[PDB]
């Protein structure tokens, strides 16, 4: 079985918005004033210049198809897997407000959602069969893309992020 | 009915939506939880 | 690796009058 | 989803085939005198003297299913009918008309074909089948799990196992 | 018997088991009759 | 077989379009000013208006239709949609929103978007419709195309081919 | 070469609410 | 394109056949005494003993793999492409008389169709994507098959094959 492990800072935060959103009964509101979109072409920008820049890993190339494959992985998982009970009614109603179809999840949420994802994602990457040469490299690009979600945990998670409508 | 069987077997194979380089699977929708 | 990446309908196996889908390997239960 | 409902004979029968091999460390003895490829050819002949005396009473569409059950099993044993335990007898089994690998059919009896209507619902929900024809073909499998039933005592000896 | 979107899980794809020829599936063809390639 | 009937007006616009390119020896400037992607939104909008003043008056049913034809089009262009000779500039093009491929959509204009409507049926065959889903649809085509051929002039300037 | 030989239902990408097939390159006609 | 060569003896062979059914009219008796099954057979044997007694051509695995391709590919093509117009009547009453289904084509046909399916055989297998390594090993498998047939060519075709009612 595959493992993808989460910095405990990280680790924390998960914990923390699960007691927000089934507990204290919050959600984020919606649409994130920063998105899966910015967060992700933000990485991109700090990955290019942490290569040029130092001392599959370097890889700007590489680090470019991992982050479209979250947009896509997250765009299809989000409504079906990385939902809590009580999340429903708010993606129900976001969702039905290019050609007036339905924004995509990643427009749309923010850096907690995405954060889930990393947590079904080895489920996920099971049932895709992945040769092991690519695994790994891709393996490491989460585990560099958590690193950088750790580092700047405070700017990416928000507490004012929660909502009570 | 007198037979199980009828060029309709034939198989198209479709596009995927892929990411990471391979198809996306199915999941069965469910309540998302944490491992721990 | 720089990359994660790298057409004719087929004949299939029939039983019962439909094709057979491929099964990923598991231990009978 | 599809249900292929299993007379409780056989259920049994499935029971003890479980404790025979994962715990009595047991294997059919293989290949079993009396194979899979014979068994259906019995219920044919069975099921075209019981017809003499609809769909169900059609004996050209039991041909079918019988064809279906040896193609699907051929498939299937390898992958999905197997016990952890049992891998090493069907590496040495298969390895042994062109020379190439005899099919699993021949080699298999009773034992493993039973094991095959516990995943055949799932399998069967894989490939969308028509209403009309889905129906009459449970039914076949009714018929067929039934007189598996029926002579249950003469297709399933004990002596079918060995122990080293 | 009206329309009102084209659109519906049922729509995933199962992959099939093919029949296979020295390593690779067999494709469709369209019946024709034989001829030799030379008249 | 599907048949989806071009008028005329865009028959001849094809024909024009092919002695262009490989005999004329001549290439739609890329990117076009007017792309396809503003193209179907035009459509969407007269298509609206139109229904001002149950089946093809469904101004929705026409935005899936939109969508779907930029989805084929994206897919199929540098496929089934080339000539020969517009190879070159396919790959130059591409090759220059995470700076990935700009998708074909975003490029290429009313001349190819045309090209399209002659693969269709070939391709609609290849995924098994509905009956009354695929006349609807078929419909929605022979709309867009009356659209297509009542505004061929403006659509379909001669200054959009280049020598260079 | 010794031999000329060498699972999960997938989501596809689809148009007009159908799955689009896939297309084996060829010039335009 | 791909292109397999036809022994210019059985060239002719395939000149004569058509020869004998549509203007002769003629059809080969049917079940061939000797078919397809046995040929394909008797080749491997050839093919065996001639690895080990000489001066992927001398893989007698990769031969099986080619003969049981062969028979795989005849069994699906020959309703389909090898006929002609006049041995439709003759096909249909065949397969009409282990479960009691059809016979396999390859267990009927003899020589004479055998033969017709490497005539169409590099348009098949343009269809399937082989790669270039494995497709070279297999079309010079069907060379040393066509010349193996070419050398026994009057034993595998006797004239007595052909009928008239």
């Known amino acids: 079985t595959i493992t993808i492990e989460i910095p405990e800072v990280l680790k924390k935060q998960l914990e923390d918005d699960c007691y927000y959103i089934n507990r204290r009964k ?85 850096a907690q959602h995405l954060l889930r994802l990393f947590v079904k994602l080895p489920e996920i990457l099971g049932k895709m069969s992945f040769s092991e040469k690519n695994l790994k490299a891709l393996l490491k690009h989460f585990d560099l893309f958590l690193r950088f979600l750790a580092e700047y945990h405070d700017d990416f998670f928000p507490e004012s992020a929660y909502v009570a409508a | 009915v007198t037979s199980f069987f009828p060029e309709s077997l034939l198989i198209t194979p479709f596009l995927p939506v892929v990411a990471f380089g391979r198809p996306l699977p199915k999941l069965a929708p469910q309540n998302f939880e944490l491992p721990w």
Chains 1, 8 share one sequence.
């Not at chain 1, 920063?34 to 290569?51: G, M, P, R």
């Not at chain 1, 470019?64 to 998982?77: A, N, P, Q, S």
């Open chain 1, 26 to 110: 919050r959600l984020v509101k919606l649409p994130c004033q920063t998105n899966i979109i910015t967060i992700l072409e933000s990485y991109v920008k700090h990955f290019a210049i942490n290569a040029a820049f130092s001392a599959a890993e370097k890889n700007v190339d590489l680090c470019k198809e991992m982050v479209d494959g979250l947009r896509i992985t997250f765009d299809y998982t989000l409504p079906l897997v990385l939902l809590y009970p009580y999340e429903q009614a708010q993606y129900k109603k976001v969702t039905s407000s290019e050609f007036d179809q339905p924004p995509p999840p990643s427009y749309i949420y923010g």
